[model samples]
Target: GYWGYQEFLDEFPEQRNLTNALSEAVRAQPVPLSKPTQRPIKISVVYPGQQVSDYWVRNIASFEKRLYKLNINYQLNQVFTRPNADIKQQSLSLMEALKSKSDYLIFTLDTTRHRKFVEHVLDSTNTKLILQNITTPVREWDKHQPFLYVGFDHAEGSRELATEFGKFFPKHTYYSVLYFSEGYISDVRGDTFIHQVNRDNNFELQSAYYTKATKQSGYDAAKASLAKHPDVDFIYACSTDVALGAVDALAELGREDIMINGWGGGSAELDAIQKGDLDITVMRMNDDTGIAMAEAIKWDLEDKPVPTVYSGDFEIVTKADSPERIEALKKRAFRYSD
Candidate 1:
């Protein structure tokens, strides 16, 4: 089922309590960390890092930096599980990591394909699971959860952006949604925004098109959607890739009145905001996830209990923000990045 599937609604509200508490706990410790375990631990990271955005790159860098600072010596194996066409590459890396039998396996769960990998790894007591970019625990897993679910809460961030949209637009607005092709991501980030914004029926979702979380796809989708609905007030991009792509489309079409928001306030997005390319972005406390992973692994190695979930917070950055204010926020957000 797509992330847009309604079944998750039952658990989303209940899980908000945990997200709120952990987000605060992690935010309080800007450089959150756990005492490094004395022994070297073997770890493997499998992620989709081939996209245009360097969010994944920064994430990996921050995690390693924090690990080094804590003196948590370890052998790390990283596999960039790029999107398919090779079809075999992604699966090969998945199996290779699973077979690596590392003490900890950090990956993701955006769809059932990802769930299958987690299921196989969960079968092994030797490899602990850390699911990134998703905070809500799967209901079926109930008591048996991963070592950590570290990242910003998609539903929370999406709703925050939705509120921004509500503030920026007139009472009745028209916007098209650009969604990631993946179910969970599109559901939590894309559909959730649509759902939250339309609660009172003041806004209209003029169009929605799924893309591969790439700038090209975003560009194509944006152009095509605009061709059909040129008068739409804004384009809601669910990922950084798509957001930039939409920006490109708007620039080419010379639609200054049409607006779009960046998904992650990465360096590029921040620059775009400064130059007035993207109206605003929900900037994630980027390095927090990496730090959370390092800390979670440290505690696990030390035979201490770790929380079932840990998530970072986000800030809505707009073009109107002062340079000094944005710089300070960047310093905090990218605290671990080089």
Candidate 2:
């Protein structure tokens, strides 16, 4: 969706007619709801970090605002995992939620770190659960019944990102990658990207490293990789923070030729996109995620059937987009700042 009108037209000139038809269809959707549905329910949201950071704050704030509009009650819990990973804190948070009186609990799983405990908690409670962001393994997932699993179509999106790179760059380009923890997002986005690059014959994967999900961590990882492969033309960051780190690395090296791209529509990424530093960044429609979870919770409470899976929207933003478009996205972009 961030392809900018002209770029989208030029890249897939054949899709103009289809786009118009879709636009017309959107114009004819069901009438908007006149009033908010006041569903009396309690929800507990447990995040893996201190809730004060920009990423956690914006996501939680957006979710709470949407839930408020729906007239639902919700509470948030922070595990304080910043500057490091702490599965113990995360497990304790889940245990606290398990003992709470909330009707539903929404959480993101950290690998298999808390899965056993989480499964035990879910087995002991009648309260519904909604798994957010990261997708747990099917084996582990099947062990417990949850109201829904909400996340992005990361594999397909990463596949599309690789193909897009092929379209923009010449054949045989070299690139490095910075990834998140060794888990779902990495497998879906990073591994898929590497697979696509290997098969397409258009790009070469120089190196891949993991970051601590912090800007400085990303920067350090990217810096070391670039130091080893200074001639590389591009760097792929698994998340916005890492991408920002790659940006700093490229700046320090004074290598303007190397392009930086990453996932997430955080404010820093948006600003870099607008300034023509970061080449592209993906936007996960977290607002839709919030809306979907809220609706699913209400449906479950009403004894109505709710879908087991809901996918978030993804958009690739680039500097080629219009100033107006960039400004509009900036307002909605997630970032760690005041």
Candidate 3:
């Protein structure tokens, strides 16, 4: 029953069954219980965000929406830190969140630096934790694990994008890659894409640049990458900001012929796809992760079996999709946030 990330990979390595099952299960709306809690459950969320895009903010909105729908009385505190591997700054926010007693803490694991905080939170049985933006549960944690690891699997989505791109451009073409940052994200998303694309001899990866996950970084990197490899007709973007930024580059340079794939079809990216700016993207069923977190907390309170992880659904959305289909998907994806 205890499956480590590495162990899980070995079992269902490609497009993992465990993850697919979790995603399918988590997407279903849980039937709300008949009663509300006696007291307001104190839940604190510390996010390494508010840097590149508004996904974090929207994620919180959906989280709160689900809490309300569940008829759970909750006092939620959200702390937004910069999207970087700054341990000091992150530690400060963690301490601030800990100042008050929390029944549950929703957090992220972006760096090894945040390990101590997780340990400290687990030390006190007073608070339970749900780790976001990562589907893989740490093997070392073993018994002392978080309440849940919830998100769309980055590698799985990357593979879908890679597969779709290969089909779209089966002929010979030059390509560029725009990565979100330097770390698991770049490796999992950008690196994953590149590795999968390598099998096909028709595609040539001309350039790869790491961005700060900011639109400005995306813009600058795209400009630089294009200048160096002008023949690049396909660009793989690793995040919402990076995708939009690449669009900016293509627009300004009058190279709209170049194709850019968006990661996480957030509202912005979806808009770009609709406007014919971004060619394709892996659209996450956004609010399910948020709802999954809330539902996990309810299950925890009810002494129910909260799943170890939830990998929500994703789909490859391309410009070829009908406008009506896109609208329906947007509705389904952003049920709470919308």
Q: List, residue by residue over 2-102, the lDDT tens digit for candidate 3.
A: 34344565654542554454455456665564556788898888887675555687789988887787788888887787676566767776786777878
User: What TM-score goes with each of the models?
Assistant: 0.89, 0.81, 0.89
lDDT of 1 by residue, 4-112 (tens): 1123333555445544554454455433234555557888887887776667888999989877766688999988855423347767876777677688888776767
Model 1 clashing residue pairs (backbone): 3-183, 3-187, 4-187
For model 2, name the residue pairs that clash. Answer: 54-336
Error of 2 at 202 (Å): 4.3
For residues 175-210, could you state the per-residue lDDT of candidate 2 as single tens digits? 888998677667667988888887885588889998
Candidate RMSDs in Å, in order, are: 3.5, 7.6, 3.4
TM-score of 1: 0.89
Q: In lDDT terms, how accurate is model 1?
A: 0.79
- By how many angstroms RMSD does model 2 differ from the true structure? 7.6
- Residue 287, candidate 3: Cα error in Å is 1.0
* Deviating ranges (above 4 Å) for candidate 3: 1-30, 34-36, 85-89, 200-202
Candidate 3: pairs in clash: none
What would you estimate as the lDDT of candidate 2? Answer: 0.65
The lDDT-based order of candidates, best leading, equals 3, 1, 2
